[PDB]
Design a protein around this ligand. Structure first.
Ligand SMILES: Nc1nc2c(ncn2[C@@H]2O[C@H](COP(=O)(O)OP(=O)(O)OP(=O)(O)O)[C@@H](O)[C@H]2O)c(=O)[nH]1
Ligand SMILES: Nc1nc2c(ncn2[C@@H]2O[C@H](COP(=O)(O)OP(=O)(O)O)[C@@H](O)[C@H]2O)c(=O)[nH]1
Ligand SMILES: [Mg+2]
Lengths: 436, 132, 184, 436, 297, 13
């Protein structure tokens, strides 16, 4: 059982840096690439197999590729902390940026690098034997994470077909943004990510800024703090493949129990508890309390209020000292609450998951050693309003055809813009029809 | 007692940052004990509480840190400023965020603001001349 | 309505020659315009829809979004004039499994994509006026294993000159067609 | 990697480029003798973008210095850091333009542009991945405007897919410096509208204003003006040379700043500037940056944004800072005075964070806003030109050299076209029916 | 597409002044003097938009305190002093770019060259005064006329708005376009300036008349379509200004269709016809200037 | 030609 990760763009690579920093600490692998001779903290010689591949004697390289068009972030890893860890031919790098231009990175610049990325990922998959799937990281604001981030998805879909492809996108915030042309890129990315990804997990930057400011009392946060707890969610949802659990859940079960219809795959991640070290040991936290704390809109990492919509199917990941009795007792209390409601045709609802190993800590990070944590992954119609707002502010610009001449200069034409706009509209109609 | 990273390079880190290094800027981790006072992963006796409404000398120092860690880092920044030159820089690796890129302190990542220059050094009337 | 209707071989839902053509249709126009002018090649009044964004300006058949009309007629016929611009139309149907499908024919797409709820088709038009016949039953049989029962709504987008959109039950030829439904 | 080929034309261009090369050579850590004496690894990483390492451990700028006289060449060579320039890049004629566009564009242009083009071809072919051409010049003189315009055109047909920056100073409205200034400026903007990719406009009167009121300098020379413009270039091209949390090259800013192909005449401000007295009393924060950044009084251009709406704006923050403060401040400045921002483009502000500030400063930023109020200078120049031209003042000096009145008439046609197009895009509304 | 562009002049003017009842714009009659004598030509320029907004003192000042622009505080006056009870009234107690007008009408004085040469009397033009709309009594034959000397003059008189001159100018332009054969090609560079000047003024009637006349000019020739493409940089801007001005009647019929008043349809038709004639490398320029245009294959 | 033909007419499975 092995899963390989693809990190695309500035945001994807910066997130994957914290991800691999957390992974190496989970399995006690020093940045040099090997565990120390002493201090065998972990149990089980095959735990690292799903993320690291054991080479020769006393060396384990990660299963990942860092690819981007600007080498100003990739080269920072080459001479940063993990010079020895990553294999040199996994840190792919280009010569020119996409420059926030989906057309550029999808038709002009990504064409000559997608083949190399596919060549590397091919021999990465051959070393594997029990491939569960892929998990990709990118932001849908820029061009590199959008154009070639979707071209690579299409190439993997045509090359492999039945392999699962988890997606963890970073969607533009409703009002707190850093780019201008990002609605175009977001719509064009959603148009092709709809038919190729199997489970896509939305993530909003300001929705995590609020969490850091309020829960973590970080009055000034930054990107690194956000990438720190993104890695926590990834590790929480992947730990069932790594460590034994009372009721485990693999990648194929997420698709089975969270995707009622082939096009409705957009999950709302959440996590609990997000607490600092000062308040962690003062307020006792139970399974029944953390599951309640993982259902408020104030703990959602995407800014869409679940009150505006209805839940289709919820997924719950538990780690630490958790037993089936208290978790399935707490699930019943959630169903009796009236402020949240599920769809009519889903009486079953949740899918629980229990793992024994508690989440590990990042030294110099922001979280603390927590006895038990929850990584909630939902599927509701409240995400229907996000696409509505993105569509509204995309159409507000498309009427004057602003910034269009950049896109048509790289090979695309207005037909793609249209056919993506109607694809988003059709997805909206799907969401209201299913929620009826 | 500033931390001493084992990494060595052609250049030496500037004195305004070498005297101020935390235990988290190490090339090799201590896998046996991650929760320890060295990494500031435990509740801190020093530092003001999150609900503290008083005045802290930091204010704007830390850019990505919680209240107690920021308080410790600004207190250490102000504590050992005597040995530094009078025109010492204001920022520091402790106050500034710890990126996973730069934890090993391999390169000279923060050097500019303490470097002697004339980037915005406009002529004073006593030193003024008309380019004769 | 149309549930208690007679529903003979022919049935019109919008005719450009009348006091209130858009009487049941709900117009929703933004960055566009709707008019009724006399075309220069058929010498008759036509309903003209033109707009910048084809996804914003449209007219749906039932005024009430919740309410739906009921048509058992298999064939749906449109009489459209090609303006050499982006144009599309969408129709809702009900199958024997009691689920709602959608058939969107678009001028600006190349692939033919089949999803459980939406089936998008490409389409190409001639220079001037042309009548298009949809044959909802055949499309329902081809896209899904089910069969056609009912039509729930029809929706036409911008950049088109519309006149005498109607339903039918047989592949009528021009000779056997009644005069009022002809092109000339 | 990415490379910038710098070109200085005429007195103004030569002086500003000399000061720019001095400050940048100090920034990367090389002495006025050209040898490296810096103390940072990050310095060596991106010195190729501006310098070529010659045999012997000495660096030289990638600059070309051009005019029609030897005097300015001698002046730039004699000055500090004048010995770092390669003596083979000192192309200059012997007759002189005489502040005559016709001489610098048709007679002296045709005889000197060959050697300048040969030098530029050599310099650009030497490097591998050209990023773009950066040109500093004026718009009032003959060889600064006429010759530089021809060089820009030739580079355009020779290098049609490369970036192009032009730091062009425009004649001051209230006080001129040359009788035939509108004659040069009309043709200059007529050619810049088609050839250059973007022109960031400067103005000597504005430089005087900022250096007198904010800096509170008693007697400012040309040195501090060229110094400020040099700092502006260092800020705008910062992210190409240093790592940052969020990156932005020339192409990204061009994409995010230009909504329509002819709208590339920007207005620039740099932050922070203060007197020596107030230096010891202010604190370095993102707010105190953004208040001075958005002041219309701080802009170094004659156009006042109070008479128009900001189409798009860009703020290249420098220094290791919190991104949440950045984007929340720009959100606030966009939300408060919303009427001064265009309505049909939401999220008008592009933001970037670089980790290496200039030496001496803890934190700095540069403002590049595309405002529709830029039309006033074009209107004033056009009316001054037509006051010149209605009864033929000083026309014999140009028509007696080959060009006819049709060029002047067509230049006014295009210029009065551009101002009207600015007016149209400023006055347009989102609903689109309210204006009729 | 009208057989005679001037065919609706008198009837439309009379309908506008009397039948519809709306106030007719009566301006730019200053300096024309009387009849039977020369009109004093003003030195003002019709095409140029000499707006030059002067916000000397009402312009708001930027506040470094709060990012919102704020107006300066009012200057206290000795006439209005502090009353006895206003202290409790104190307890019980938005900037914008000014106009930047682009759709306002630009002034056009009657200084066109056509008016000067007509008052001079060197034009062989007379009014038939027929029962139908009046034709032009040409003293000398049209085919032997020197187009180089006359076509710029008549195209310059289209901007003119007073009754006796605009009709003559439009009808003469129509007649020369219809009768002329290959003589139109060499003079096409000289007609750019008058057409641009007529389009610059934001007056509806002149805009629609010059749009129809441009359609006839590009139609009534052999290969002038290939010749107008380099000049698209000076004509299409007004098309961009008024491309989407169109009246929307949800279910009503546009009665004012026999007269080409809605310039939104005229602009689209003119763009399509420009695309048709001389279409080789012609769509690119139109798309470059007009951003929303769609190629008609 | 295939990328145009399978892209201009409606084709099902
Ligand atoms: N959570 C998080 N988001 C980031 C980070 N860095 C960038 N982003 C997001 O990424 C979006 C823009 O894309 P980038 O990551 O900057 O770069 P890109 O996706 O590769 O696109 P280009 O750089 O233009 O080629 C921004 O809107 C940010 O919200 C990060 O470190 N953490
Ligand atoms: N900022 C700056 N502007 C200058 C300098 N020298 C000249 N200028 C400006 O350039 C204009 C004159 O340009 P000119 O010398 O005739 O250019 P040239 O003769 O074509 O090389 C004047 O209006 C000055 O404002 C300088 O050293 N710095
Ligand atoms: Mg990127």
């Amino acid at each position: 059982r092995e899963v390989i990760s693809i990190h695309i763009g500035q945001a994807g690579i910066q997130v994957g840096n914290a991800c691999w920093e957390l992974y190496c600490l989970e399995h006690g692998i020093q940045p040099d690439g090997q565990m120390p001779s002493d201090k065998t903290i972990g149990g089980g010689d095959d735990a690292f197999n799903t993320f690291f591949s054991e080479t020769g004697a006393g060396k384990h390289v990660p299963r990942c590729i860092f690819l981007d068009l600007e080498p100003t972030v990739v080269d920072e890893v080459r001479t940063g902390t993990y010079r020895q860890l990553f294999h040199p031919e996994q840190l792919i790098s280009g010569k020119e940026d996409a420059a926030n231009n989906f057309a550029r990175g999808h038709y002009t610049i990504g064409k000559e690098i997608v083949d190399l990325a596919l060549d590397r990922i091919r021999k990465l998959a051959d070393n594997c034997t029990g491939l569960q799937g892929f998990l990709v990281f990118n932001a849908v604001g820029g061009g590199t994470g959008s154009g070639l981030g979707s071209l690579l998805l299409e190439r993997l879909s045509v090359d492999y077909g039945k392999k699962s492809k988890l997606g963890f996108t970073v969607y533009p915030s409703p009002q707190v943004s850093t780019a201008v042309v990002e609605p175009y890129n977001s719509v064009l990315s959603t148009h092709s990510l709809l038919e190729h990804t199997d489970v896509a997990v939305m993530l909003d930057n300001e929705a995590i800024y609020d969490i850091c400011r309020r829960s973590l009392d970080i009055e000034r946060p930054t990107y690194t703090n956000l990438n720190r707890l993104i890695a926590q969610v990834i590790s929480s949802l992947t730990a069932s493949l790594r460590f034994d659990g009372a009721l485990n859940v693999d990648i194929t079960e997420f698709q089975t129990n969270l995707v009622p219809y082939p096009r409705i795959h957009f999950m709302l991640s959440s996590y609990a508890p997000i607490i600092s070290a000062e308040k962690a040991y003062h307020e006792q936290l139970s399974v029944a309390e953390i599951t309640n704390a993982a259902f408020e809109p104030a703990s959602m990492m995407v800014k869409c209020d679940p009150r505006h919509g209805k839940y289709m199917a919820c997924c719950l990941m538990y780690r630490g000292d958790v037993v089936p009795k208290d978790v399935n007792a707490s699930v019943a209390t959630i169903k009796t609450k009236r402020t949240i409601q599920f769809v009519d045709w889903c009486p079953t609802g949740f899918k629980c998951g229990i793992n024994y190993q508690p989440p590990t800590v990042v030294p110099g990070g922001d979280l603390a050693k927590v006895q038990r944590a929850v990584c909630m992954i939902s599927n509701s119609t409240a995400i229907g309003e996000i696409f509505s707002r993105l569509d509204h502010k995309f159409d507000l610009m498309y009427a004057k055809r602003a910034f269009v001449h950049w896109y048509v200069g790289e090979g695309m034409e207005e037909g793609e813009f249209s056919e993506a706009r109607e694809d988003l509209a059709a997805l909206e109609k799907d969401f209201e029809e299913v929620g009826a | 007692s500033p931390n001493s990273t084992g990494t060595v390079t052609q250049y030496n880190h500037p004195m305004f940052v070498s005297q101020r290094l935390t235990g988290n800027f190490t090339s090799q981790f201590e896998m046996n004990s991650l929760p320890s006072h060295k990494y500031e992963t435990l509740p801190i006796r020093s530092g003001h509480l999150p609900g503290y409404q008083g005045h802290v000398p930091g204010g704007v120092g830390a850019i990505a840190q919680r209240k107690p860690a920021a308080a410790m880092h600004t207190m250490t920044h102000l504590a050992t400023s005597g040995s530094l030159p009078k025109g010492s820089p204001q920022t520091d690796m402790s106050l500034v965020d710890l990126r996973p890129e730069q934890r090993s302190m391999a390169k000279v990542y923060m050097y500019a603001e303490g470097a002697k220059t004339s980037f915005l050094k406009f002529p004073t009337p006593k030193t003024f001349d008309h380019r004769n | 309505m149309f549930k208690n209707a007679f529903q003979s071989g022919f049935l019109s839902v919008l005719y450009s020659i009348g006091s209130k053509p858009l009487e049941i249709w709900d117009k929703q126009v933004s960055n566009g315009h709707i008019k009724r002018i006399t075309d220069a090649d058929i010498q008759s009044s036509v309903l003209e829809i033109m707009g910048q964004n084809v996804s914003t300006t449209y007219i749906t058949c039932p005024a009430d979004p919740n309410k739906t009309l009921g048509i058992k007629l298999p064939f749906l016929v449109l009489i459209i004039k090609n303006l050499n611009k982006y144009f599309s139309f969408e129709v809702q149907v009900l199958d024997d499994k009691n689920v709602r499908r959608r058939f969107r024919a678009s001028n600006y797409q190349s692939t033919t994509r089949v999803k459980p709820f939406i089936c998008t088709m490409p389409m190409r038009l001639d220079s001037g006026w042309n009548q298009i016949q949809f044959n909802l039953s055949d499309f329902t049989r081809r896209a899904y294993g089910t069969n056609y029962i009912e039509t729930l709504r029809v929706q036409v987008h911008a950049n088109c000159r519309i006149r005498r959109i109607y339903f039918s039950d047989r592949l009528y030829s021009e000779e056997e067609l009644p005069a009022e439904f002809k092109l000339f | 990697m990415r490379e910038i080929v710098h070109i200085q034309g005429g007195q103004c261009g030569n002086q500003i480029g000399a000061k720019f090369w001095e400050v940048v050579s100090d920034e990367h850590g090389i002495d006025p003798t050209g040898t490296y004496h810096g103390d940072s690894d990050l310095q060596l990483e991106r010195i190729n973008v501006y310098f070529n390492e010659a045999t012997g451990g000495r660096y030289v700028p990638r600059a070309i210095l051009m005019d029609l006289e030897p005097g300015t060449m001698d002046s730039v060579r004699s000055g500090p850091y004048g010995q770092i320039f390669r003596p083979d890049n000192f192309v200059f004629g012997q007759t002189g333009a005489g502040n005559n566009w016709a001489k610098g564009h048709y007679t002296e242009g045709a005889e000197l542009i060959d050697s300048v083009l040969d030098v530029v071809r050599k310099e650009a072919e030497s490097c591998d991945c050209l990023q773009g051409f950066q040109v500093c010049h004026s718009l009032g003189g003959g060889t600064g405007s006429g010759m530089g315009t021809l060089l820009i055109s030739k580079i355009r047909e020779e290098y049609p897919d490369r970036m192009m920056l032009t730091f062009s100073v425009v004649p001051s409205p209230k006080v001129s410096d040359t009788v035939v200034e509108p004659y040069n400026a009309t043709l200059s903007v007529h050619q810049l509208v088609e050839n250059a990719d973007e022109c960031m406009v400067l103005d000597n009167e504005a430089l005087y204003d900022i250096c007198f009121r904010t800096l509170k300098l008693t007697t400012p020379t040309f040195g501090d003006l060229n110094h400020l413009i040099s700092a502006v270039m260092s800020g705008i091209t910062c992210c190409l040379r240093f790592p940052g949390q969020l990156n932005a090259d020339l192409r990204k800013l061009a994409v995010n700043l230009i909504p329509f192909p002819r709208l590339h005449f920007f207005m620039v401000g740099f932050t922070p500037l203060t007197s020596r007295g107030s230096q010891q009393y202010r604190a370095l924060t993102v707010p105190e940056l953004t208040q001075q950044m958005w002041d219309a009084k701080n802009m170094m251009c004659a156009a006042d944004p109070r008479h128009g709406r900001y189409l798009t704006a860009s703020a290249l923050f420098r220094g290791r800072m919190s991104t949440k403060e950045v984007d929340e401040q720009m959100l606030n400045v966009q939300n408060k005075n919303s009427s001064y921002f265009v309505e049909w483009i939401p999220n008008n502000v592009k933001s970037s964070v670089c980790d290496i500030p200039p030496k001496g400063l803890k934190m700095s930023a540069t403002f590049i806003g595309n405002s529709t109020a830029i039309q006033e200078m074009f209107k004033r120049v056009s009316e001054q030109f037509t006051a010149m031209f209605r009864r033929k003042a000083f026309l014999h000096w140009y028509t007696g050299e080959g060009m006819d009145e049709m060029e002047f008439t067509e230049a006014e046609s295009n210029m009065n076209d551009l101002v009207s197009e600015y007016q149209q895009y400023q006055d347009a509304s989102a609903e689109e029916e309210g204006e009729f | 597409m009208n057989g005679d562009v001037a065919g609706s002049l008198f009837t439309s003017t009379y309908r506008n002044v009397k039948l519809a009842g709306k106030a007719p714009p009566a301006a730019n009659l200053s300096g024309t003097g009387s009849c039977f004598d020369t009109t004093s030509l003003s030195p003002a320029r019709a095409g140029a938009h000499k707006a030059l907004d002067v916000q000397k003192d009402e312009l708001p000042v930027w506040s470094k305190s709060t990012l919102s622009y704020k107006y300066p505080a009012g200057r206290p006056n000795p006439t209005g002093f502090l009353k006895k009870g206003d202290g409790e009234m104190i307890k019980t107690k938005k900037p914008s770019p000014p106009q930047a007008g682009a759709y306002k009408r630009r002034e056009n004085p009657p200084n066109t060259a056509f008016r000067r040469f007509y008052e001079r009397g060197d034009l062989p033009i007379a009014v038939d005064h027929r029962g139908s709309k009046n034709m032009i009594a040409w003293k000398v034959d049209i085919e032997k006329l020197d187009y180089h000397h006359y076509l710029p003059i008549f195209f310059d008189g289209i901007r003119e708005t007073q009754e006796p001159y605009r009709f003559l100018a439009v009808k003469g332009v129509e007649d020369m376009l219809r009768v002329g054969g290959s003589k139109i090609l060499p003079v096409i560079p000289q007609l750019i300036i008058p057409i641009k000047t007529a389009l610059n003024t934001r007056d509806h009637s002149v805009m629609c008349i010059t749009l129809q006349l441009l359609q006839k000019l590009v139609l009534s020739a052999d290969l002038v379509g290939e010749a107008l493409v380099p000049y698209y940089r000076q004509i299409l801007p007004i098309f961009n200004l008024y491309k989407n001005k169109n009246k929307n009647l949800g279910d009503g019929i546009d009665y004012g269709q026999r007269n080409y008043d809605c310039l939104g349809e005229l602009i689209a038709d003119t763009l399509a016809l420009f695309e048709q004639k001389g279409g080789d490398d012609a769509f690119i320029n139109i798309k470059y200037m007009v951003p929303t245009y769609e190629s008609s294959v | 030609l295939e990328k145009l033909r399978l892209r201009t007419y409606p084709t099902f499975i």
